[model samples]
Target: SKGEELFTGVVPILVELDGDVNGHKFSVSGEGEGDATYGKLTLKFICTTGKLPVPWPTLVTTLVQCFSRYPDHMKQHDFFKSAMPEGYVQERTIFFKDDGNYKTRAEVKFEGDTLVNRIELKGIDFKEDGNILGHKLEYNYNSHNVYIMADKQKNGIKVNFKIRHNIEDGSVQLADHYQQNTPIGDGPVLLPDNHYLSTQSALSKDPNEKRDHMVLLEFVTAAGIT
Candidate 1:
């Protein structure tokens, strides 16, 4: 009875991140929950962040670099199609595609000293027809603060993005795929496992190499059952 009650009442609290750089402040928040049935567990993620200005050439260049690492030209490619990392396996597939046509849209807004970026992607693969698969990602940055902290400043700079989707069938699933050739030390500073729902890696600010300040974020989540 105790376990059953706890299972029914177990709800995840929202996770929020807020901070300020050079007098400019920003925050990111999201919520998620998990369920267990038989021998399997399922989790759902619903997160959003406030808008920030879009850094023009720098932002676009960073995005292009990120996408270039992926094999976008592959005829049949899905997010989970890649192999999983060590000690991880395919739990269940939550997303699938029938048609190949997909499109993505992105926008950036500037608010005084702050910059906001938003993105939307459609035509995601689901089990049934006309499934709504959408996600929202937003980033806020302060130009004054960022510029002051930087050794060099670039004009028309901004950052933020989002992703959203919907599904109709229940057969979709997901698999873990994490590949890193270099040591973890070469990666970005990552948050510990407890506060966040999943694991992510990034790389930023290499003083020895004389690179500009950079940041990367990656994570995984699942939905539906096959």
Candidate 2:
């Protein structure tokens, strides 16, 4: 039952990063106990800082948007619907607040007899000292790792790219980019060949094509293994 106990008590935190830059550090320190019929787990998340203009908030928002695109019927399914913790469902509970700060906490509980699971999260934003140049958010999932289940969903995930312009700011650029059909499990999901964007692409663009500058934002998703 150690696997179940570990799974029940284990907290898997997924980390996505851009380039080799280490944007955040996450640690899982907790324990759990249970048998075939019942179990309990506890987890904690700690966030670290090292990069500027952290884009995790943007990444989380983008994921939510992608999930929302699923059909109404699909949302009722166990794999797709159950994958997300309650914190994400409550909305505003897992997002950035004023002054560009992240506020979120996540927890998962499961009962074997009933095959029921519960996940709760509180306060998505965290305060930073002046030393915290940039911010990255972390959470404790215990046993629930959604990335592993993403591929099992009936509606395969998709990635799209688009360009948008703001009238007030007079800024025009590409927007609404995403990754589709990836088999990344519970931990950080790294993209192959840095397809999203690479240094080579950025350096190859012409200055006249200022829009190409956006390629600098491409990054690799990193996952932690038990």
Candidate 3:
């Protein structure tokens, strides 16, 4: 009757990498023992296997992401630096068609820690009245992940954009922007995974080939502009 309480289980959230192992389960034991603590309560992790455990680089990544609650009490691993050696967050602008010809163009420039996205919508009442309309966001690559700074006022208002990426393959996926203000800003604007930006690769590592990366939205301001 004294052996009913026990902490024996497997941790599914933690596992090995893609190619190495599959059934990477961590077992728990000896919690009912009297030597676990004295008078203070604290958390601890220990392994009991005689062999070495398999490594999971990708799985470790997600766990580390949640550990940020510790702030300064946690170890800082540069997942961004290892991912972007060329100092840039790569992307590709995907035109998801809806139905429109509202005279607008998008620009994604990789320039020194900045993914500059400029969506200029023309052929509107503002353009006829000497005004401008656009959207811009900053994909800042100076942290554990991409620091996405939204566009200023009047910019990116009617135009919608988002930062999306593959959860497994780590690919940057952008989408079509919709335009309603200029009537072209309601379409899809692009940016992707999964990190910040700089003047570098377009999701490729070879550095000799070309890849299509995305840009962040920005506000192109002018006097009396829409």
lDDT of each: 0.21, 0.24, 0.21
What ranges in model 3 sit over 4 Å off? Answer: 1-20, 28-45, 56-59, 64-226
Candidate 3 lDDT (Cα, 0 to 1): 0.21
Candidate 3, residues 1-226, lDDT tens digits: the string is 0110111121111211111112333321111111101111111112333221321111111111111111121112212112211221222232322211223343322234222223322221221111111111122211122222222242222223332322223433232433222112222322211122221111112244232222211111111111
Candidate 2 lDDT, 92-134, residue by residue in tens: 2222323233332222222232222122222223334311223
**Candidate 2's error at 140, in angstroms?**
28
- Measured by TM-score, the strongest candidate is 2
Ranking by TM-score: 2, 1, 3
Best by lDDT: 2
Candidate 3 Cα deviation (angstroms), residue 17: 14
183: Cα error in model 3, Å: 35
- How do these models rank on lDDT, best leading? 2, 1, 3
